[PDB]
Design goal:
Strand order of the largest sheet of chain A: 1-3-2
Distance between the termini of chain A: 51 Å
Organism of A, B, C, E: Homo sapiens
Distance between the termini of chain D: 61 Å
Chains A, B, C, E: Glutamate receptor ionotropic, NMDA 1
Number of helices of chain D: 10
Structural class of chain A: alpha+beta
Number of strands of chain A: 6
Entry title: Human GluN1-2B with Fab 007-168
Keywords: Channel, heterotetramer, receptor, antibody, MEMBRANE PROTEIN-IMMUNE SYSTEM complex
PDB class: membrane protein/immune system
Helix content of chain D: 40-55%
Oligomer: part of a larger assembly
Number of strands of chain D: 0
Chain lengths: 144, 96, 176, 286, 48, 51
């Protein structure tokens, strides 16, 4: 999911692919000044990428609309304490679904125990694992 | 930078949903249908596959100019020494 | 030692190339001998040195520069490949105990046994994991424990498994 | 394939800027030697000597006569011996490393789209009345029958035939292929790609429709991934004996295919020689 | 000798996987990073 | 000469060990003063060796 600001007039710009096809884009609304210490406010933006094309493909065979709402916390969210009592509450992403203001979570979600326990997933659409990354190399010894 | 290692616990991705909403059955069927039309592979090769970088975990280091400075230095020092040695030999021949 | 670091055809091609270069140098003497040019070309590559076969003016000169370069390249490319092949020799199995998965599920081409009715059979039975290895051993096992060493030294067996001290003595004494 | 990637490895050592300095130093030293000798030795008959000396001296040349020139050509000889030793050492180091290549990519290839208009006729083994055949039938149909001409025998017989003189190809499920290639005699079988497949749909457990057992079984299965026992079970009963890095190829023959750039340089050389001959002939007539 | 110096000199500071000795053994010059309270952290927090 | 200077390079890869004598019985460790240096060995008292 690529994010880029809207083009002054409010309409997203035009771009082409390697095959010269226009990339599908939506009017995506995430809070401004993603830093948590600032008074974040809504600013219309442009969101476009893999998952967006997937949902567009879903639309053409389901006859339904959509209005993208970007997260207001910037996190996936896990089972955490409510910070008021011993009750554990959902934060981050899945809470936005669970409260009243979301219906599909098209995003880099991932299957596990608790999240599948509290909501019903679908069949997976990618089989990515978990891996590790380091830095590359450079030339070597023998000096003089 | 590059990614190394093997793959430990391997979950999958997935479009989430609510509990007992009318869409779930049809959205799962649509995902399953589209996964058998090359669509997932098509979009993967369209977006996640224009990787210009290459690993090429081979080809040990090639000798750069850090292992030849000494030899050129001794060549230059020899030239400098011979410059004076020519005059020394000329003077020795003239005296003798 | 002959063609094996080189392809079985490259030698005749390099011979044809030496002859071609020699005859071209011999027939480039009209700008203002055949045996001498042949000798010089046949010699420079072989690195022997016979005859003062100097070349002509400014054409066989550059031809000689490049000919010497090619000869050096070939000669110095032989040694690199031969050294690589020799370094990459000496293969073997060198079983690292039970950790090697080969004997954890081996074929009948790999043989390994032990003495019958000893404690090792009891230990192998007390293992839900290596049942197939136990069956493979039970296919052919020796009743005695002294003829097993002779059988191994006769190469009918080559993976005898047995306790420590006897093995240490029999290996420190019998060289093979 | 037991192949070593050595297309133009002959020029691999000595990163391609030290040769320019070699030439510059050669010319400078030749000019210096001529100038010293001044105070039948021209200024062209010295580059010949020094080039031959740098290149495993074999052609007769004319040595200088001054003592200083003698000491200088001796120093140049030291340079040449050091340079040649280092070059051959690095060539030996370079030729060691060669592991494998990728013969073909996935299904998207004109190689797979060449049933007959190609090299001697090809085939790809498939198991009859299987899910793969129906999937490819829904997919590209030219490979189903027009290219899917030579149907193979069963799972073991097909792999044996590929190990035999047929050796066309094989299309089948990913997990069984990975297991079978993992534990086999030798290392003659590998799966191309190994992590980029076209119809990822996984295995699973089926239950009667609308039974009500789905929640508990699903949660139990997803809990197993939580504490990671499935990895232990797979490594116990899926990991084979092969697939532990690689060592080398060490192509003994090193045929003309891998060693050809030297002959290209030699061809450029004879072209330059003919050009110089023509130029001299033209400029010497007027 | 130079050949021996140019064939066996390659550093191998590579982490093989979750069983790498440098990974299981805690270190200060070989730190590893993750993401704040996500689906990767819960997997480790489940396994003591 | 080429095959020689290649095989000699093949010989300069293997290094065996730096092993030493075995057991607690050797002149190098029999008398603490009957050696080239004054050997002040490591033997922590109040332990197995001390008894």
């Amino acid at each position: 999911v690529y994010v880029k600001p809207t083009l002054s007039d409010g309409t997203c710009k035009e771009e082409f692919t390697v095959n010269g096809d226009p990339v599908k884009k939506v009017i995506c609304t995430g809070p401004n000044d993603t830093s948590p210490g600032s008074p974040r406010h809504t600013v219309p933006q442009c969101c476009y990428g893999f998952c967006i094309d997937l949902l567009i493909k879903l639309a053409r065979t389901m006859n339904f609309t959509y209005e993208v709402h970007l997260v207001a916390d910037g996190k996936f969210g896990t089972q955490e304490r409510v910070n008021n009592s011993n009750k554990k509450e959902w934060n981050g992403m899945m809470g936005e679904l669970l409260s009243g203001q979301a219906d599909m979570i098209v995003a880099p979600l991932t299957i596990n125990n608790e999240r599948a326990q509290y909501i019903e997933f679908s069949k997976p659409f990618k089989y990515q694992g978990l891996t590790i990354l380091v830095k590359k190399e450079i030339p070597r010894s023998t000096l003089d | 930078l590059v990614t190394t290692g093997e793959l430990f616990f391997r979950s999958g991705f997935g479009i989430g949903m609510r509990k007992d909403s009318p869409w779930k059955q049809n959205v799962s069927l649509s995902i399953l249908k589209s996964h058998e039309n090359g669509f997932m592979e098509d979009l993967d090769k369209t977006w996640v596959r224009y990787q210009e970088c290459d690993s090429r975990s081979n080809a040990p280091a090639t000798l750069t100019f850090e292992n030849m400075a000494g030899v050129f230095m001794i060549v230059a020092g020899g030239i400098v020494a011979g410059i004076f040695l020519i005059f020394i030999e000329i003077a020795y021949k003239s005296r003798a | 030692s002959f063609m094996n670091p080189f392809q079985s055809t490259l030698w005749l091609l390099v011979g044809l190339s030496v002859h071609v270069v020699a005859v071209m140098l011999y027939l480039l003497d009209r700008f203002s001998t055949l045996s001498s040019a042949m000798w010089f070309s046949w010699g420079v590559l072989l690195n022997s040195g016979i005859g003062e076969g100097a070349p002509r003016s400014f054409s066989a000169r550059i031809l000689g520069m490049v000919w010497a370069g090619f000869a050096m390249i070939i000669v110095a490319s032989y040694t690199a490949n031969l050294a690589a092949f020799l370094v990459l020799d000496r293969p073997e199995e060198r079983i690292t105990g039970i950790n090697d998965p080969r004997l954890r599920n081996p074929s009948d081409k790999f043989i390994y046994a032990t003495v019958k009715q000893s404690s090792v059979d009891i230990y192998f039975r007390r293992q839900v994991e290596l049942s197939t290895m136990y069956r493979h051993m039970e296919k052919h096992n020796y009743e005695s424990a002294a003829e097993a060493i002779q059988a191994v030294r006769d190469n009918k067996l080559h993976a005898f498994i047995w306790d420590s001290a006897v093995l240490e003595f029999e290996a420190s004494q019998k060289c093979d | 394939s037991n192949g070593t990637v050595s297309p133009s490895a002959f020029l691999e050592p000595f990163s391609a800027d030290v040769w320019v300095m070699m030439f510059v130093m050669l010319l400078i030293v030749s000019a210096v030697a001529v100038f010293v000798f001044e105070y039948s030795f021209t200024i062209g008959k010295a580059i010949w000597l020094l080039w031959g000396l740098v290149f495993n001296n074999s052609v007769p040349v004319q040595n200088p006569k001054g003592t200083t020139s003698k000491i200088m050509v001796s120093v140049w000889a030291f340079f040449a011996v050091i340079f040649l030793a280092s070059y051959t050492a690095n060539l030996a180091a370079f030729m060691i490393q060669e592991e494998y290549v990728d013969q073909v990519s996935g299904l998207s290839d004109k190689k797979f789209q060449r049933p007959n208009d190609f090299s001697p006729p090809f085939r790809f083994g498939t198991v009859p009345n299987g899910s793969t055949e129906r999937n490819i039938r829904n997919n590209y149909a030219e490979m189903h029958a027009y290219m899917g001409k030579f149907n193979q025998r069963g799972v073991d017989d097909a792999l044996l035939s590929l190990k035999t003189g047929k050796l066309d190809a094989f299309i089948y499920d990913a997990a069984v292929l990975n297991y079978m290639a993992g534990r086999d005699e030798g290392c003659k079988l590998v799966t191309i790609g190994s992590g980029k497949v076209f119809a990822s749909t996984g295995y699973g457990i089926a239950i009667q429709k609308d039974s009500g057992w789905k929640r508990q079984v699903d949660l139990a299965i997803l809990q197993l991934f939580g504490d990671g026992e499935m990895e232990e079970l797979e490594a116990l009963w899926l990991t084979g004996i092969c697939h532990n890095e690689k060592n080398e190829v060490m192509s003994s023959q090193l045929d003309i295919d891998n060693m050809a750039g030297v002959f290209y340089m030699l061809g450029a050389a004879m072209a330059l020689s003919l050009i110089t001959f023509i130029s001299e002939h033209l400029f010497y007539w007027q």
